[PDB]
Design an enzyme around this catalytic site. Structure first.
Site, PDB file in Angstrom:
ATOM      1  N   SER A 145       2.515  -0.141   2.300  1.00  0.00           N
ATOM      2  CA  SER A 145       2.571   1.252   2.788  1.00  0.00           C
ATOM      3  C   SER A 145       1.780   1.356   4.086  1.00  0.00           C
ATOM      4  O   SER A 145       2.152   0.681   5.065  1.00  0.00           O
ATOM      5  CB  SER A 145       2.149   2.196   1.656  1.00  0.00           C
ATOM      6  OG  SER A 145       2.471   3.543   1.984  1.00  0.00           O
ATOM      7  N   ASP A 241      13.343   4.474   0.913  1.00  0.00           N
ATOM      8  CA  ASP A 241      11.916   4.515   0.619  1.00  0.00           C
ATOM      9  C   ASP A 241      11.463   5.948   0.309  1.00  0.00           C
ATOM     10  O   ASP A 241      11.796   6.891   1.038  1.00  0.00           O
ATOM     11  CB  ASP A 241      11.135   3.941   1.802  1.00  0.00           C
ATOM     12  CG  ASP A 241       9.639   3.947   1.568  1.00  0.00           C
ATOM     13  OD1 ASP A 241       9.137   2.936   1.046  1.00  0.00           O
ATOM     14  OD2 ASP A 241       8.973   4.962   1.881  1.00  0.00           O
ATOM     15  N   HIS A 285       8.862   2.713  -3.756  1.00  0.00           N
ATOM     16  CA  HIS A 285       7.837   2.599  -2.722  1.00  0.00           C
ATOM     17  C   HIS A 285       6.788   1.573  -3.147  1.00  0.00           C
ATOM     18  O   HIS A 285       6.231   1.683  -4.243  1.00  0.00           O
ATOM     19  CB  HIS A 285       7.170   3.953  -2.435  1.00  0.00           C
ATOM     20  CG  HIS A 285       6.246   3.929  -1.254  1.00  0.00           C
ATOM     21  ND1 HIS A 285       6.683   3.673   0.030  1.00  0.00           N
ATOM     22  CD2 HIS A 285       4.904   4.092  -1.167  1.00  0.00           C
ATOM     23  CE1 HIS A 285       5.653   3.696   0.858  1.00  0.00           C
ATOM     24  NE2 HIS A 285       4.562   3.952   0.155  1.00  0.00           N
TER      25      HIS A 285
HETATM   26  C1  LIG Z   1       4.673   7.433   4.851  1.00  0.00           C
HETATM   27  O1  LIG Z   1       3.916   6.376   4.324  1.00  0.00           O
HETATM   28  C2  LIG Z   1       2.568   6.674   4.153  1.00  0.00           C
HETATM   29  C3  LIG Z   1       1.829   6.164   5.387  1.00  0.00           C
HETATM   30  O2  LIG Z   1       0.705   5.823   5.319  1.00  0.00           O
HETATM   31  N1  LIG Z   1       2.500   6.069   6.660  1.00  0.00           N
HETATM   32  C4  LIG Z   1       1.784   5.579   7.821  1.00  0.00           C
HETATM   33  C5  LIG Z   1       2.665   5.804   9.038  1.00  0.00           C
HETATM   34  C6  LIG Z   1       2.765   7.063   9.589  1.00  0.00           C
HETATM   35  C7  LIG Z   1       3.588   7.274  10.679  1.00  0.00           C
HETATM   36  C8  LIG Z   1       4.294   6.236  11.245  1.00  0.00           C
HETATM   37  C9  LIG Z   1       4.193   4.979  10.693  1.00  0.00           C
HETATM   38  C10 LIG Z   1       3.392   4.760   9.582  1.00  0.00           C
END
Ligand SMILES: COCC(=O)NCc1ccccc1
Ligand SMILES: *[C@@H]1O[C@H](CO)[C@@H](O)[C@H](O)[C@H]1NC(C)=O
Length: 339
Positions: A145, A241, A285
């Protein structure tokens, strides 16, 4: 069980100024090292970081961390749970910087919180060289993640750090799990643009040079930063996802059916030229530190097998594929999806 070590350099801290750290389980008969980056969203201004401090404090502080952790999934030492790398040296790096592992800013009289994710990775690597990493043949930087995005942001800097310290023989590679997102239209980029300013966030040099000042937020999106990287990187991404759908405001009629199908098609398209990848048609996820990560298959090949085939390729292989992307267009059209 992996044992906790707080960083000897106490200037490298979690959000609230407490020392960062890592959990380690050594394997003296092995020259492979797995360093795993935990995930857990992020916070991007004073008010939402204050809220996170109230009810998600273990992601902002080490004051309450336990002395041990059980290694699960790819961090497990038993061959039945981890057919890929069960004999490796295992490191779990907790996420306590709330910055997608990009920050390089200390707490001070002008900063209520410290955002040091990028520096935490470097300091863990530095201190591990004194405990055995100096003898490694392969260092695999993995993460899930926000930790998966963290792999994309930091793998080339780790490779450069070891080169400049005098260890050109260690091969650095990346494994990014569930951190490959699309900046698409919602069903019904700004938070990261604010975050980078708040964190003094850092992105890989070649990507920053392409997008330049004010546009470094682009480098948080896999399909834009991946082509700029030099280290080998294996990409694991569910086609549907759940965190992607959350930010898209998806919680079935024709409009939503077409939205969901187009999202899977777009994700599949961005992976077409990624030679090492594993992307099943499931609504889920994360996967690599889940105990049942051995269960899912694409075109008849498991994720531990695909990673093993990736290892062989870095010495096309007969019956040992490394590019595995589902083509069916709806969640759970793959029968092996997580229940
Ligand atoms: C959505 O997943 C949870 C998270 O931590 N995302 C980090 C992120 C935010 C914006 C662009 C790329 C990665
Ligand atoms: C501790 O970490 C800080 C921040 O990266 C760095 O500036 C400093 O030189 C480090 N100290 C030592 C003794 O390595």
């Amino acid at each position: 069980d992996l044992r906790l070590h707080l960083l000897l350099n106490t200037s490298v801290t979690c959000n609230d100024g407490s020392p960062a750290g890592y959990y380690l389980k050594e394997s003296r008969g092995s020259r492979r090292w797995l360093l795993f980056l935990e995930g857990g969203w992020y916070c991007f201004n004073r008010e939402n970081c204050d809220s996170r401090y109230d009810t998600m404090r273990r992601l902002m502080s080490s004051r309450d961390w336990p002395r041990t952790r059980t290694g699960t999934g790819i961090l497990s030492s038993q061959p039945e749970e981890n057919p890929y790398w069960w004999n490796a040296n295992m490191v779990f790096i907790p996420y306590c910087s709330s910055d997608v592992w990009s920050g390089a800013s200390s707490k001070s009289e002008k900063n209520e919180y410290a955002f040091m994710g990028a520096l935490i990775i470097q300091e863990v690597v530095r201190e591990l060289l004194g405990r055995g990493l100096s003898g490694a043949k392969v260092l695999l930087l993995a993460g899930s993640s926000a930790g998966g995005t963290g792999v994309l942001l930091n793998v080339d800097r780790v490779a450069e750090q070891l080169e400049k310290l005098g260890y050109p023989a260690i091969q650095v590679r990346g494994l990014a799990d569930s951190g490959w997102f699309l900046d698409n239209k919602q069903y019904r980029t700004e938070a990261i643009r604010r975050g980078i300013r708040y964190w003094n966030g850092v992105v890989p040099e070649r990507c920053r040079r392409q997008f330049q000042e004010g546009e470094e937020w682009n480098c948080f999106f896999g399909y834009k930063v991946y082509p700029t990287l030099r280290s080998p990187v294996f990409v694991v991404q569910w086609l549907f996802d759940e965190a992607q759908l959350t930010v898209d405001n998806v919680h079935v009629q024709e409009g939503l059916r077409l939205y969901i199908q187009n999202l899977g098609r777009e994700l599949r398209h961005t992976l077409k030229d990624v030679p090492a990848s594993f992307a099943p048609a499931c609504l889920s996820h994360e996967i690599i530190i889940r105990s049942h990560w051995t269960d899912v298959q694409v075109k008849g090949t498991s994720l531990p097998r695909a990673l093993h085939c990736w290892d062989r390729s870095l010495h096309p292989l007969k019956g040992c594929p490394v590019h595995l992307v589902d083509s069916c267009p709806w969640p759970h059209c793959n029968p092996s999806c997580p229940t």
